[model samples]
Target: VKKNDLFVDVSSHNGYDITGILEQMGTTNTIIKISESTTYLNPCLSAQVEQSNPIGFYHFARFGGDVAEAEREAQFFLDNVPMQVKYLVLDYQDDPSGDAQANTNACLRFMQMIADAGYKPIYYSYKPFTHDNVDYQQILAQFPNSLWIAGYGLNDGTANFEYFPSMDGIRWWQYSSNPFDKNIVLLDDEEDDKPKTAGTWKQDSKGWWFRRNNGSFPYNKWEKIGGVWYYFDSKGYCLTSEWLKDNEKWYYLKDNGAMATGWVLVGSEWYYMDDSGAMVTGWVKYKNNWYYMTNERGNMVSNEFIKSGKGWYFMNTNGELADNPSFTKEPDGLITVA
Candidate 1:
């Protein structure tokens, strides 16, 4: 294969200094194994950083079937990785569990954690090992073209293009591994071309929708803009002063398009929304006081007595139960609660 100066992974095993070898190999990018189980930083990190374009760091995965462990490993990797380098990788090679599902779940847990930290999460592994151990379907669902597989055709310096692992989404394929591992970028990952840009709001008579710098609009999702939360519908229209039911959960959007929480008054009705802005039903406790909300509308009971499920509760004007209640005797010698 023609040398396009591809990215190659290096660890402390390659020694502290890797500049000369990278220059000799004509590598444009470098993937450094930052740590193995939160232990040590790659000794060649500084040298590789000086000689590369993308300083991608990989966290060697050894957590096996444990997702919590994967998360912690990702956190540690993030804590050490430089902000300048956006390419973060999970170098999952061996299958500890030997089960594809468990291994996929654990590795994805690490990957999602890294992605949420505002970094490009890349999965690196041997091609054959991935076929049996990693569930690429679930991984592809989130990251469509983030697979970096290594399949060597020759142990010599020259790569044999004949045995190119030729898979579905091979972003980077390590084509050769002689004295040093060499790679060739199959498809340049330009997914995040215009990243971290403040988008503009556009209206096309359909209502308001945010158009990002990348020319993509957010629809059927909630976005926090200018310290305020806004929900955009499937039609890309921003909803204001209305109730929205999504996935069986109710949320009331305020006039300003902010999600309503706590006690919200909408159309002469009082509803209690939880901390996550989901309208709660039945009994809810807020500030040490218990109040009942309707099962239908989540409306808070006030100035009325509610009989629900063998429980009699008298709600006061402030949507709270009174300390002392009256038990007056009726004309038929029966105690009537009013």
Candidate 2:
């Protein structure tokens, strides 16, 4: 291993089995942070210690900065950690400005206290929250070796963590929490001065930008998307992640292959009839799920198919034949065709 090289896993919430995951993946050195209160009810520090994993501790930085409570919390971990842990992590995000100074100070004091206990201390923050308020260099001046510099996308927490301007010399760089092809939680093994508990996920600007910016396609409710046609939602959008149009367009199956000279939309409710208007009656979704019935006379039999509009119904199957009541429009606004 390089002189000061280190790797840490900071993502304890990606919903994966992380405790022994890395160890099984052949990880030789690391500082993994487990949520001591909930998931690590008994605190697996001793178990990790038994596995010979390089140890470090970590805690979440809640919104309101409570140094006294933080101190007590750290003591709990320090008191219980059986082995000599080398570092501690302060996880933080979405902190308000009203508590900004107190937040910074609380984290600083805790880091120093941990250092005093003989372990290096590191701070973690998401990229968006980092640029919003945290004054990295200003705080780093106090605890010189603190600040793990958590960020996503590019390795550009330099300004956010100015204490490690070169970044090449920083304690940690959590480049990402979810890389595209790889598992959602991956630590950057090659970063300089890596911390004891951290990893980075792969990220792509265009892909993430699409996910963050793209709007869902609008279609009539219960509409299908892609080649697979399905009903759209009320507002006409794909309801499921996997949606495709079912191909049921009527095609005349020729001996050698399938062939249809042409197709046409006819009648109400969107039905397809041959070019001659002599075949296939009723509204067939995907050409298989029939929603209407056809007459024996090679015509759509049901009055529902022709009852859509007032001005379009014929007296009967033949426009020239005797007028049918369903096809005849009366003065009462009722068009009853016989």
Candidate 3:
């Protein structure tokens, strides 16, 4: 729930009045960057110089779906950009007039190339396509670092936290597109120096492995990947005690980050996952209460008759469990309210 008060202008193309926007936001540590690829000029330089806050430019480029092109642009930015500039923004906008899949592949390939170059790359793109897509999930899983999503909902350049393009992994949100694009850095720090990807590492034929900074680690070694501490072992693999779901079932990973089989208790809740690490779902009775997982594969919701079960029924707006239960049955045998 921690929030940053800094005003970030994700887009400051030519003729955009960034200073006026900063004045309205109370003039804190404003970070302004332009998204255009061809322009290396900082349009807000004069205004920033007057205010004594030199704006930094994030060098931009396209993936072009080829590693050679990605390397060319990557090296071009490195050669031209100042050493102080540590962040590179890859503009992975969707191509409505061209092959969409190619665009995504190029973006992903380019991102991997940038990471390999030892630069902390922040993924940037127009929202919706940027955050809510299967391609983005793969991109985020690989990089799992900072993301800058741009979209316009309110002209005031501000939006509710829920209005973010993704429920999680959102570092910046550009809520206004007209008169200039305005944004807010969702985290307390502008840069997240941690490893973006961290979770349980499974044992494979290659032996016990640990993933760190997009690479693997060996046994008995403990390291911080994405700012999370993890340990590897020889018994199998290191596992973390976190809720992991596979094949629509929830399972717990216990050792250093290895998936746990059988019964597990995460916090106050008790759940069971099969040998394959799939959390058990469906109608069940436990501890004097009846519960069941909905067809949506949700967790066991308490005191709810999911179907024609023998328990008191409850439902929420999104077809999940309701904290305070209430319901009205429709003629179609469906409980329409809760």
Candidate 4:
């Protein structure tokens, strides 16, 4: 439960059974099939499943099909369901004629077909309590995306390996044979499973973004290449061309992730900037009226500043406009200020 592990149930004849189990276990991340007869779950119907986590619906493409049939099924799944439903859980139950080799070939062929179509396959190998005749090696040799072994000796929460016969490729163990099949995920392979490292760029539909680790710039959040801070939206996209307020100080990041420079209009009032793209926070004069860049606490510097032939006026510590002591202005309108 600590990680977002995936639990898939195979041969889910009806989603109702597994739905009850997930409801009971309070598991939001689960995959169920409405019926093996269908190509894929209805989008509207899948959305109604009660899940706070990313649950998926299964496209039960039974394992006896050839590669061509598997490709058709894969195409149907791609066209019908959302991309999140990545696993094609194939059900490999006991064949009526008991041709173990044929069953293995069917599973391998179908798995290959799905993989070629860019989908992960989870093999559901079912073995009855009476026989240990399943050819696991042949099925496993294909290294089907994941293995879901079914063995229900005692119907307890624990996996009854004695009855189930554990194999090397097993990633999910279905320990219970009840109508509501119970299985445990043995691996965490989701994309977000690994914590993102610093300096690595993540690309979404919007654009490429960055994150920093060294000098304390919102350690885990997406920050600009510069010292400016930014945030990712609900869809994991970095925002830009917006006003940001952090730690009681105001700032704006341009669309290109650069800090806004020069005279910037923040909210209703205007603010000034120096060459370094930082908001001038002390005393600034714009036009005729002189204004202080910051208030008593030395914050919220007004953008108001003035320029004339004599010199430029800035703000003072007392939050009032004063003569520019940093520089002087020439008659030709060339003004130099520190």
Q: lDDT of all predictions, in order shown? A: 0.69, 0.42, 0.50, 0.51
State the TM-score for model 2.
0.41
Rank list by lDDT: 1, 4, 3, 2
lDDT of 1 by residue, 1-338 (tens): 11122567777777767776678766567787777775667767776666666557887887887888888888888888764676788888864686788889988889899889888788888877887887887887888778878877655654444456766766777766777777766554564444443688887775678887788887889987664578998887789898888777888899767898666777655567755788766543332223455646543342233443333456765667545442221111111100
| Cα-based TM-score, every candidate | 0.54, 0.41, 0.46, 0.46
- Tens-place lDDT per residue, model 2, 1-338, is 22122343533342234445554334535554544422242345445445545646566655346677557656655665555655676666644446556766666666777777877677766545654655666557876645555544343311111112233224555543442101111122233353331222123441111111245443442221221223333443223322122243332322211121223223322333343222344433221122243544333343232333332233344433233324333221111100
Summing lDDT over every window of 10 consecutive residues in candidate 2, give the lowest-scoring window: 329-338
The candidate maximizing TM-score is: 1
Model 3 lDDT per residue over 1-338, tens place: 12333444433352344556556655434444443334364555445434524233354555445546656655655554443444566655643225555555666666666667766566777666653332666666777746767766556544433344653566666666555555555553444454565544556774445554456455554445555444455543555665544455555666455565444556545454544566656544332233443325444432233333323445544557554434333111111000
RMSD of 1: 23.8
Q: Distance (Å) between predicted and true CA of 287, model 2?
A: 57
Inter-residue clash pairs, candidate 1 = none
The reply for model 1, stretches above 4 Å from the true place, is: 1-5, 191-338
lDDT accuracy of residue 122 in candidate 4:
72
Evaluation by lDDT, superior candidate among 1 and 2: 1
